[PDB]
Amino acid sequence: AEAGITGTWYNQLGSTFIVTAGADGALTGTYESAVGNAESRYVLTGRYDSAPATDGSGTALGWTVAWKNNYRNAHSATTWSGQYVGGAEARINTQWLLTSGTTEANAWKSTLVGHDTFTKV
Amino acid sequence: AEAGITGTWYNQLGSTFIVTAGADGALTGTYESAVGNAESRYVLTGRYDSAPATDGSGTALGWTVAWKNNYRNAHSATTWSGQYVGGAEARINTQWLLTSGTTEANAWKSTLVGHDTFTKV
């Protein structure tokens, strides 16, 4: 993990995420959407649990991205929760929660759930 | 459970659900939205796991409601997954998934997640 996590990751839609896993559990980087324009780039911050292993378990981690930068303010934030698996074909399997700010009446429609798998290729 | 599940349940918004838990795990009934008009009523079907207990565990259950009746077709369905706890103040605690039919491009926004607690009062 750590060194293994550091780098560029891609999901099945083209989104790219670049992260640095620091010695003490920190995850910092940026997430870029499709198109790949100068700024479809948002800041991401998270944590990972290193021990992590004598039985091949994955490394648990999570990060958040608030969808606001100098070109867009989508009034929402997404958190990804999952684990990193290293090896020939390392990947990060996650489940995500995307919450949008709503009025109290619309709170029922505030959170979408999905999943993403990131690879180094 | 079973007898205990059979009856009328209300959640914190006013929605009402009426169910019959059958001998062999079946759950059948109707769900009614707020307003409580003749037909904000939709059919619900589900299952419950009876054993269910020498340690006070809840009874696991789940049901589905497709949001189509003779007055509305919301092109969506919701599934509730949770457990029934009986007693003085029996309740059903659930987490739900509401999926709307979308085109393949919009599939990311197809499922909302939330939770509901139902009581007999």
Binding site: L13, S15, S33, A34, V35, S40, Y42, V65, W67, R72, A74, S76, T78, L98 | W108, K109
Partner: peptide, 6 residues
């Protein structure tokens, strides 16, 4: 369309 996607 949301930034997470496009």
């Amino acid at each position: 369309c949301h930034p997470q996607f496009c």
